[PDB]
Design a protein around this ligand. Structure first.
Ligand code: NA
Length: 491
């Protein structure tokens, strides 16, 4: 018979509503309850969980009909876990102004517009045909629909509960249905044997919260968990030493960085930001703390961007002499500069910060750690430097250089980055351009402006480490989620 699967997790998301649950901990549950119109086929063509190939999922087929619209022909007879049939009304509601990107929608789905292209209202043409469209040109609609924005929600059930209550009792069409949630303790899912895709291989999946990695590792050894999440390379020797267990790691499409509150006088100008960027010996941090498993990106540039990945782009430079030169040009007077970090919320954050403080001290810059406890929210006027992480969530270069650092977004509006006019004009263009030499050249120009301006300093692409009992065949994917479709067998 099928075995129950137990996953020892770092935590649970604030909600299981597909958008509001977007976090380091939500997608690994959400991916099981819901399906999107398009699925990223991570293991296609022998790829090691990193293929960017998008394949139809709830959409039987789709045809792009112009630079801003796609007509989807949906699978018919597919049911949500409540017994309701999925139709074009459910898909239109999922990406409607009412639920997702209108002004009232973002009161209960705050990131609905942030994670969306410039949508126009979906058009339901018949029971199973829906045109999803943007107001302005967008050759990124397919990638958005294959991203964490994509999960299809049941209109009648979602509308009767609202986004918050739906988040505590989600209903989707996915291989595993929601059974129960005990806040910050566990989520249990059950096999959806009415699933339109392959039969689920686990009878139940339990995500059990174990805050401390050491206790997660104990639980795996003891037989409490079959898989455990959120380990670092340092934990690999202990786990791999057991003949019944093994680590399963992968580079993830996330970016660890530090950024500045550019409203502060010292960071209004690019000079000290550039001095702080050029003084970081990123290879040293990667060798010492990540066992050379983390990757330094060659600019704001990753292979999963696809046509907008530039493999020939030169690496970001460590130039202590040029950093010292810029410290003098900035007029820095030795006042201590705080670096806000919520402990090791981002893996190895305090150890990396302690190494960077010494690199900054070498360039003649005094940076002091301000390790704020979790839950606390330091006010903006108190932040000088702060660590940040950005999930590189589309299989495209738009996210996050354009989505986070673009015009009207946080880095410019809230954190005062006065980006050069060409950067904002190229940001607007790459959202609308089709992939080609113009689009690829514009991203390289945006990358050059980003490095020149230093609104943030890219540290590295982290290496995520899972551990599992060898009798559970399951491979990680290059994203902060877990995929069990064609990837979960009990030996
Ligand atoms: Na993990």
């Amino acid at each position: 018979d099928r075995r129950a699967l137990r996953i020892g997790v770092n935590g649970l998301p604030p909600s299981l509503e597909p958008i509001n649950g977007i976090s380091n901990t939500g997608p690994r549950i959400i991916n099981q309850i819901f399906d999107a119109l398009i699925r990223r086929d991570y293991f296609a063509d022998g790829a090691k969980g990193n293929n960017i190939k998008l394949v139809p999922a709830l959409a039987e087929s789709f045809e792009r009909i112009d630079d801003k619209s796609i007509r989807f022909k949906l699978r018919q007879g597919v049911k949500f876990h409540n017994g309701a049939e999925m139709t074009a009304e459910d898909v239109a509601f999922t990406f409607s102004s009412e639920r997702l990107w209108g002004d009232e929608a973002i009161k209960t789905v705050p990131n609905g517009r942030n994670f969306s292209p410039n949508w126009d209202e979906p058009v339901v043409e018949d029971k199973y045909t829906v045109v999803l469209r943007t107001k302005t040109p967008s050759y990124l609609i397919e990638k958005y629909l294959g991203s964490w924005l994509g999960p299809i929600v049941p209109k009648e059930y979602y509308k009767s509960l609202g986004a918050v209550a739906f988040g505590n009792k989600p209903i989707g069409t996915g291989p595993y249905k929601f059974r129960e949630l005990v806040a910050n303790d566990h989520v249990t899912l059950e096999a959806n044997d009415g699933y339109w895709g392959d039969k689920p291989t686990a009878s139940t999946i339990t995500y059990q919260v174990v805050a401390e990695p050491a206790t997660r590792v104990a639980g795996l050894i003891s037989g409490e968990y079959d898989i455990i999440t959120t380990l670092t390379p340092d934990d690999m020797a202990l786990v791999d030493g057991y003949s019944d267990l093994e680590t399963r790691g992968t580079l993830i499409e996330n970016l660890h960085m530090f950024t500045f509150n550019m409203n502060q006088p010292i960071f209004q100008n690019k000079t000290l930001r550039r001095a702080l960027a050029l003084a970081v010996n990123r290879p040293l941090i990667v060798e010492a703390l990540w066992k050379n498993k983390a990757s330094i990106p060659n600019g704001f540039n990753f292979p999963h961007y696809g046509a907008t990945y530039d493999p020939k782009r030169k690496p970001m430079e460590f130039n202590l002499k040029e950093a010292k030169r810029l410290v003098k040009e900035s007029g820095y007077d030795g006042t201590p500069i705080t670096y806000h970090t919520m402990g090791n919320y981002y893996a190895n954050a305090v150890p990396a910060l302690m190494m960077m403080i010494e690199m900054w001290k070498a360039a003649g810059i005094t940076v002091v750690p301000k390790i704020f406890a979790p839950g606390t929210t330091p006010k903006d006027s108190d932040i000088l430097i702060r660590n940040w992480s950005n999930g590189q969530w589309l299989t495209d270069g738009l996210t996050t250089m354009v989505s986070e650092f673009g015009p009207g977004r946080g880095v410019q509006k809230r954190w005062g980055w006065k980006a050069p006019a060409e950067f904002n004009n190229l940001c607007d263009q790459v959202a609308q351009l089709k992939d080609g030499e113009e689009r690829s050249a514009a991203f390289n120009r945006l990358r050059d402006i980003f490095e020149d301006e230093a609104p943030a300093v890219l540290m590295y692409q982290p290496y995520d480490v899972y551990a599992a009992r060898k009798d559970v065949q399951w491979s990680p994917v290059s994203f902060e989620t877990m995929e069990f479709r064609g990837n979960l067998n009990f030996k």
